[PDB]
Amino acid sequence: IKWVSFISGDMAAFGEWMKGQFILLQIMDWVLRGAAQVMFVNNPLSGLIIFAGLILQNRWWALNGFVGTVFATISALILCQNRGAIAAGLYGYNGILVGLLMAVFSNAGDWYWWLLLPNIFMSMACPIVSSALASINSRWDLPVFTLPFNILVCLHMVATGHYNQYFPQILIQPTTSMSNLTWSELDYAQLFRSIPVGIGQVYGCDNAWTGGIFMIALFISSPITFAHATIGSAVGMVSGLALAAPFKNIYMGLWGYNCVLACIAIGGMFYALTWQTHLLAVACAFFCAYLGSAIGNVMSNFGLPACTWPFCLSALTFLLITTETKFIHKLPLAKVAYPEQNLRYYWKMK
Amino acid sequence: IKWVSFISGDMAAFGEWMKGQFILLQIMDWVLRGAAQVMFVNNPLSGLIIFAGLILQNRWWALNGFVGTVFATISALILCQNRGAIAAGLYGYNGILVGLLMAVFSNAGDWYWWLLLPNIFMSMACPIVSSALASINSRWDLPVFTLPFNILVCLHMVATGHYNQYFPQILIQPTTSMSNLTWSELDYAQLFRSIPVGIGQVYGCDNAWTGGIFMIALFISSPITFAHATIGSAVGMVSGLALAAPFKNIYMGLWGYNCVLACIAIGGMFYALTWQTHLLAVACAFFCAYLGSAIGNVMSNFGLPACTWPFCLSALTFLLITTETKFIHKLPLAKVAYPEQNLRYYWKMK
Amino acid sequence: IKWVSFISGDMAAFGEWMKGQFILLQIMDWVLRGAAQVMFVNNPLSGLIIFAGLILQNRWWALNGFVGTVFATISALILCQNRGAIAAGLYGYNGILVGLLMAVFSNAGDWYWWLLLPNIFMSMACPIVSSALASINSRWDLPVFTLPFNILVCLHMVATGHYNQYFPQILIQPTTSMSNLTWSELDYAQLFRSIPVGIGQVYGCDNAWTGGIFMIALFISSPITFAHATIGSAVGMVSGLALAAPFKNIYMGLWGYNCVLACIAIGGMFYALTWQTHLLAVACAFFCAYLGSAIGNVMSNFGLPACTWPFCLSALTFLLITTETKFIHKLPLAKVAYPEQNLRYYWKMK
């Protein structure tokens, strides 16, 4: 009971205890804590679970993610960006995403040690871009989200491109052939297995076991996040079916990571939870899937993956709408927390 | 005399009378009224005339435009976006443009009933994007314009693309051949006929009779709008000649719809009318044509038409310039009306 | 001594004296003064030196730059944009860049007299876009930089493209072949000669003598600008080596003009000079080189050069970061001057 409360939420007691210890242990929390905040979680335990899932899939990707997030945190410190924001991990999840997605899309092969240096440089530059986006987005009271990650990875990726001698990348070509979609060949087992692999694809992992581990991590923190995550993956696969995407893309979960993230964000994290806000989250996740198709097709010309760009665009657009009803209530950015605490704050204010 | 005044302008008396009647009649005004406000008109009569022109050209396109605008209005209501703004049609013209331009560019053929569903979804999502753009553009006191339409249609279009099984689109390929322009083959009859078809191309109509019907609708509302519209089409065709565009493009009016809209906007709608503002409108329409060429070439790589994107970019840029003279006077967005009333307000203030 | 002080800085005494003379002499200062403010200099003498360097390389390019900047100044006057800002040359450097880079990339051949007309139109439109960007960027207290130049040249360029009958352009194709980089074939003489040609490439000049002339002009104004300029070119060539760019590109200086400009801007012009700000300038120039590779690859699909786009993006991002230390101090835009005067102001305030 008490222990379950302790391991839930943002882990506040652990937070004070870690305050006392040496700078080195702390940097570990701040990196474990920021590892799991891609999915809007401030739980170090869940972050360790996320890391375990990364190790399970591929050791090289996990090592790159770890080094990227640790160097993003170190860069946030050296720049004196903020304390209490770095300590909550707001500067590390961009770094881990940059490292992981640089390791995923690199054609140089596994254990290519020279990949660390661009990884280091991109991850260190993440706090700079995060502060730059925070300066712009603070006028409208909007969060940075995953935009630094997108900007930095897209740079490495286009800069170098597939035809590079030192840091080659994977081929991304625009579609130029009519993909006949034999509906009788659809497999329902993989179609429903697209739910865990879809949530696992947030970090580039396409292993159903890693997706299940990520779902376990989300459930440990807050069941509401888990529910919105699984419903986001479901609407992502449904939209992929509706837009005649190849069945392999749906099975791999390429249509689900933007939707799961967008449903987590709008439904419980930044909008106070309500049935109206729940349908807003579902509509936002559908629009995020459809815009994800659009973005993936647009970015294919340059030779780049869609990444988390659709999620940012949809989440910002929804987070910006103004309404004449009191049910859809945007929370002030200073008082945003895990969705249960946000609902508690909404109840206390009302 | 009195009747002519009644059918002119924004139609204010009709506006109060319609206030009383059932919600269903009202939704019809609000859709008729918003049909004609692509060209910045609040006249239901003109909207009916615009609809008649659409029916004249192609029944399928007109049906798609009608359903798109009605569902945009319904979505504005269900979201409680605003009343008095929905009642003026500020949320319907984006919907009708989305529906019409989805029907125009769809390669599935006429009377393809499955086209309604993406049409419904895009049109319903128009108020969301309109509010999102209004949140950003209200800081600088700028209007949303046709930006939601552009964003939503470009999404459907790229998402799906030509190589799609369910919702195929038309081919748009970048130019890769030297187009020899035999100046002796120019036809002056079609060159001057490019004026009505250019204004008709605002809705995707390339019929000279439909363009003339649209010009009649504009004249019914306000002669100043008609004058700026025809001069915008003229500068569009002149710029198309100056940039060595193929003569067929000029004849079809592909070079005129952005210019006519931009000249209508800057000259009388948002800047108080003056000879200085008139030359500003002409320069804005020339820049809009030249940027329209640029945008049409840029978007051709992705497989998308230029759409109304050039108009938005030019109009915003001009609406943002700051000046040290009192002749170019930007009106406050709350007190914008038909250009005659705007000039009356300018005279009353001065 | 006194004369050296007179020819240094912003040339203030000359500034008052020129105030009295006829409008025609003045327009010459305001064009000479704005010619050299691409590199953030308000010295007419240096501007004449910049012009001499342009003449040295190619007469046609220099003539186009002169006419572009004079028409940008005339357009700033006719629009009543500002006095004291036009008199300082804030509206002319965009014009000279537009003219020079239109003359450089035009495939019609030297002394193609019809190139003046698009040159005139783009250069006259530069104050409009400059005011539009100033309206947006004044909220965050940020400068327009070279953005109007980029927007206007990219328009001419895409609009027309290589396959145009009247205004053909040069081929820019995306890389599709594996460039084997024989490290033994590197030449150190040209590798170090990439420093002056890199700074000369700011205006499109790829002559080492013209680069040296530009360096002399920078030294005349302020030695700090010269130091940051040469270190920016050095980091540009180093980054070009690190990203496996073809050695010819590094030798020509295609990797240095964005970095030299960004190091000049962040290090001394807009951030008060400090060792912390100096390392910030070096990091900004490295990020500017790497983003320059990214942008050059992205824009290659449309058929356009990278231009000064990377510089703008990097400079704005760095100029937007918020920090918790007092060493990195962003100056108010009203009180920005040559870096020596900025350091003097910083010392006086502190």
Q: What is the 3-state secondary structure (H, E, C) of A252-299?
A: HCCCCHHHHHHHHHHHHHHECCCHHHHHHHHHHHHHHHHHHHHHHHHH
Residue of chain B with shortest Cα separation from A286? B121
Separation in Å, CA of A17 to nearest CA in chain C = 25
Number of residues assigned to chain B = 350
Instruction: State whether the Cα torsion A14-A16-A22-A23 is positive or negative.
Output: positive
Check if the beta carbon of residue A295 is closer than 8 Å to that of residue A260: no
Residue matched to tokens 């918003």: B34
Angle ∠(A234,A237,A240) on CA atoms, nearest 5: 150
**Separation CA B35–CA B13 (nearest Å):** 19
Subunit partners of chain B (3 or more CB pairs within 8 A) = A, C
Check if the beta carbon of residue C319 is closer than 8 Å to that of residue C330: yes
B186, B192, B194, B199: CA torsion to nearest 10: 160
Residue matched to tokens 């003219």: C99
Residue spans of beta strands (DSSP E) within chain A: none
**Separation CA B2–CA C79 (nearest Å):** 42
**Separation CA C258–CA B294 (nearest Å):** 24
Check if the beta carbon of residue A99 is closer than 8 Å to that of residue A123: yes
Residue of chain C with shortest Cα separation from A80? C324
The backbone region for A141, taken as left when phi is positive above 0, alpha when psi lies in -120 to 50, beta otherwise, is: left
Put simply, the answer to whether B323 touches C136 (Cβ < 8 Å) is no
Contacts with B164 from chain A: Cβ below 8 Å: 243-244
Maximum C-alpha span of chain C: 61
| Residue in C131, C139, C144 with CA at minimum distance from that of residue C40 | C144
Q: Which CATH superfamily is domain C188-349 in?
A: Ammonium transporter AmtB like domains (1.10.3430.10)
Q: Where does CATH 1.10.3430.10 sit in chain A? A: 2-160, 185-349
Check if the beta carbon of residue B200 is closer than 8 Å to that of residue B185: no
- Count CB-CB contacts under 10 A for residue B84: 7
Contacts with A123 from chain C: Cβ below 8 Å: none
Q: Is A209 on the interface with C (CB under 8 A)?
A: no
Indicate which of C130, C164, C167 best probes the interface with B, i.e. most B CBs within 10 Å of its own CB: C164
Q: Phi and psi at residue B330, in whole multiples of 5°? A: -75, 130
CATH topology of domain A185-349: Ammonium transporter fold (1.10.3430)
Q: How many CA atoms lie within 13 A of C164 on its CB side?
A: 26
Q: Which amino acid is at B15?
A: G
B163: nearest CB among A178, A320, A322: A178
Separation in Å, CA of A325 to nearest CA in chain B = 7
Contacts with C283 from chain A: Cβ below 8 Å: 125
Separation in Å, CA of A282 to nearest CA in chain B = 13
Indicate which of C321, C324, C326, C330 best probes the interface with A, i.e. most A CBs within 10 Å of its own CB: C321
Q: Is B302 on the interface with A (CB under 8 A)?
A: yes
End-to-end CA distance of chain C: 29
Separation in Å, CA of B302 to nearest CA in chain C = 10
Q: Where does CATH 1.10.3430.10 sit in chain B? A: 2-160, 187-349
C317: nearest CB among A81, A129, A165: A129
- Count CB-CB contacts under 10 A for residue C4: 8
Indicate which of B140, B277, B293 best probes the interface with C, i.e. most C CBs within 10 Å of its own CB: B293
Check if the beta carbon of residue B211 is closer than 8 Å to that of residue B198: yes
Contacts with C161 from chain B: Cβ below 8 Å: 175, 297
Check if the beta carbon of residue A137 is closer than 8 Å to that of residue A143: yes
Residue matched to tokens 């087992």: A189
Put simply, the answer to whether A293 touches B129 (Cβ < 8 Å) is no
Put simply, the answer to whether B80 touches A301 (Cβ < 8 Å) is no
Put simply, the answer to whether C301 touches B297 (Cβ < 8 Å) is no
- Count CB-CB contacts under 10 A for residue B171: 9
- Supply C16's token pair: 């008052």
Q: Where does CATH 1.10.3430.10 sit in chain C? A: 2-160, 188-349
Check if the beta carbon of residue B116 is closer than 8 Å to that of residue B67: yes
Residue matched to tokens 């269900």: B78
Q: Which amino acid is at B133?
A: L
- Supply B60's token pair: 């399928």
Check if the beta carbon of residue A126 is closer than 8 Å to that of residue A105: no
Instruction: State whether the Cα torsion B15-B18-B20-B25 is positive or negative.
Output: negative
Instruction: State whether the Cα torsion B4-B6-B11-B17 is positive or negative.
Output: negative
B71-81: b (≥16 Cβ within 10 Å) or e: bbbbbbbebeb
* Residue C330 DSSP symbol: B
Separation in Å, CA of A125 to nearest CA in chain C = 8
Contacts with B322 from chain C: Cβ below 8 Å: 131, 134-135
**Separation CA B240–CA B220 (nearest Å):** 29
- Count CB-CB contacts under 10 A for residue B108: 15
Residue of chain B with shortest Cα separation from A283? B125
Strand partners, A106: A169
Strand partners, C330: C271
CATH topology of domain C2-160: Ammonium transporter fold (1.10.3430)
**Separation CA B41–CA B33 (nearest Å):** 8
A163: nearest CB among C178, C243, C286: C178
C165: nearest CB among B179, B297, B324: B179
Residue of chain C with shortest Cα separation from B315? C132
| Residue in C198, C261, C196, C264 with CA at minimum distance from that of residue C228 | C264
Look up the CATH number of domain B187-349: 1.10.3430.10
Subunit partners of chain C (3 or more CB pairs within 8 A) = A, B
Indicate which of A77, A86, A123, A128 best probes the interface with C, i.e. most C CBs within 10 Å of its own CB: A128
Please tell me what resolution, in angstroms, this structure has. 3.1
Q: Phi and psi at residue C155, in whole multiples of 5°? A: -65, -45
Restricting to B residues 135-174, those with a Cβ less than 8 Å away from any Cβ of A are: 135-136, 139, 154-156, 158-161, 163-167
Put simply, the answer to whether B158 touches A301 (Cβ < 8 Å) is no
**Separation CA A309–CA A291 (nearest Å):** 9
- Supply A218's token pair: 């989300």
**Separation CA B302–CA C9 (nearest Å):** 49
Check if the beta carbon of residue A69 is closer than 8 Å to that of residue A92: yes
Check if the beta carbon of residue C102 is closer than 8 Å to that of residue C156: yes
Radius of gyration, CA atoms only, chain B: 19
The DSSP H or E segment spanning C35 is helix C23-35
Burial of C333 (0-12, 13-18, 19+ CB in 10 A): middle
| Residue in A273, A281, A184 with CA at minimum distance from that of residue A236 | A281
**Separation CA A341–CA B347 (nearest Å):** 56
Put simply, the answer to whether A244 touches B125 (Cβ < 8 Å) is no
